[PDB]
Amino acid sequence: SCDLQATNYIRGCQSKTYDGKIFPGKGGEKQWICKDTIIHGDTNGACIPPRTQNLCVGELWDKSYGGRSNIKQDTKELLKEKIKNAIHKETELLYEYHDTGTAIISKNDKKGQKGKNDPNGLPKGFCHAVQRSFIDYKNMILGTSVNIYEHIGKLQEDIKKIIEKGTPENVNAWWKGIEREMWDAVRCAITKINKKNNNGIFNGDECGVSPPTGNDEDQSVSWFKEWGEQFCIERLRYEQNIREACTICINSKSGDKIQGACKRKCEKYKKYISEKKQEWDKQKTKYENKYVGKSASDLLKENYPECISANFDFIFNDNIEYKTYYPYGDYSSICSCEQVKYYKYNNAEKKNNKLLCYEKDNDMTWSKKYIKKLSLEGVYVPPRRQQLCLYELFPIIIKNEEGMEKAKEELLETLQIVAEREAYYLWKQYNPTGKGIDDANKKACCAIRGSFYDLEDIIKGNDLVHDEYTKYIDSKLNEIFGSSDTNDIDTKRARTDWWENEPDRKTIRQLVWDAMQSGVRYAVEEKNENFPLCMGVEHIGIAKPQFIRWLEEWTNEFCEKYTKYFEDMKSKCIECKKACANYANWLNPKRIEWNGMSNYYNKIYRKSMIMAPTVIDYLNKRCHGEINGNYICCSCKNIGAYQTTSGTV
């Protein structure tokens, strides 16, 4: 039902070149620009996409010399028609650009041209590109600190004139009203491809009925999502190339090194990351400042299915020790000739790389983020759970795609390493934290047991947090252990069985516990101290449900930190006003956490009663008196009986 210019020539609006020229052409590739420019201005932590830099402005602006708007002597309907034509031509141009398979987004990860098409007959990436382009029209018609073209700012103020001299900021409103008719330029130009196609039916609603959503309205995030889609899409291409040269590595050195095409393919990725890190580092900092509590890594992992195998924390690391140990980061384990093996405590010669997890932060807070789907709302994640030493597990899981024996073989020895390192580092955190010596390690033997159980729940697939790491680990373990033929029920029982049982008499649950004693043995050896009794136990009691374990962790901590604050405030009791400000500053997020945590307890037990005691009651038995280094791990100066009055209103 549109009479708008179909086989139209908009001046200056020719075929796209941002991702390079369409063959037989070659080059003209525009690059992401993140820094401030004389041409574009302040980006403000943002990176301008090449797709943006090639926007079809056509008759609205002229690039000849400095660049000037033609819009000066235009009317309101004249200006709308121009925007409508420009938008319509940009979709047409973006059809060709993707149908040719020139746009990085329109590329495949292995299969040349084969399988790079969505449900409809529209090329891979066409809709995303068109959607993004539409947002750029919106932001260009309104006010933006980034100038897509050299002097285009002039156009935005001239637009003001037209809209101010019309029937009724006013333009922020004019776009609001005009936007539907502007999006229909996208839909009606999509209808045109059907006429071109034979038995390939089109109607326009294939890229959506309405113009891009709420989240995307923010140029900054629309551009960041594109950066993400492209990074992931390119990253899987670097993967395939590493996999064609490494699984399909010659020990040259004095020892096991990659040297041929494998070194070449891995270095190509190592170089790729070295480049893309600045763009990430910038856009991460700016996004997360614009959206508190929101994670960059999430905005991407959600929207783009190619990002599933991606872990930005591991790819884009600031840790020097990591950068050398994992030189290819993400694909390090694949780009390594070195045999995946955990070395037992008094194994002659060769020792494990206790190649540090990040420095465990004591100042860290509890979190309701990265929590599992199924409600589970109310539960808080402990800080020492958040500082999990399961980093080594991520590259090795990426390595083994075919989840056969080798996958679960390599995972087992990597589990033992992860287990050793965590235990090593926890001792170094909790022993310098403890009061007495026979109390410092008594406090340490529990953080260890906690993590042993949490590490256990992760593998068993019983854990309550699918974070930057554990999310893909759950997905891959379900791949490795369960088939499509066997439901989740057998899959849960597959992981639980692998861990619980097993050459030697030792089980996978046992080898992980043995490995944890080894880490404490090296930690205590360093300080020339004696290995504790709480750590020397062949067996660890059956883990309590994670929620209840974590609820005890919360309570033990609160009790200590309360008797710290309240006591050091009362002692100082004006100067109290600053002590009160601190005590209350700490306590306010505790009230939020206690309500949530104690509410869950009742939902899972007490409420529809059911022969279960109260939250306080349970914790009263659990925290009365001194600590034990095994399953008796909570202590309070005053029993929880007062805590609900302390933590409410």
Numbering used by the authors: 1218 to 1385, 1399 to 1478, 1486 to 1491, 1494 to 1613, 1618 to 1745, 1751 to 1821, 1836 to 1870, 1882 to 1922
Paper text:
The structure was solved and refined at 2.9 Å resolution. A total surface accessible area of 1340 Å2 is buried at the interface between DBL3X and DBL4ε. The canonical Cys(-1)-Cys(5a) disulfide bridge, linking subdomains 1 and 2 of PfEMP1-DBL domains, is absent in FCR3-DBL4ε structure; this absence is characteristic of the DBL4ε-VAR2CSA domain in other VAR2CSA variants. A novel disulfide bridge, however, is observed between C1689 and C1906, connecting Subdomains 1 and 2 of DBL4ε-FCR3.
VAR2CSA is the only member of the PfEMP1 family that has been associated with PAM56. The extracellular region of VAR2CSA comprises six DBL domains (type ε or unknown (X)) and a CIDR (CIDRpam) module arranged in the following configuration: DBL1X-DBL2X-CIDRpam-DBL3X-DBL4ε-DBL5ε-DBL6ε. Here we report the crystal structure of the DBL3X-DBL4ε double domain from the FCR3 strain.
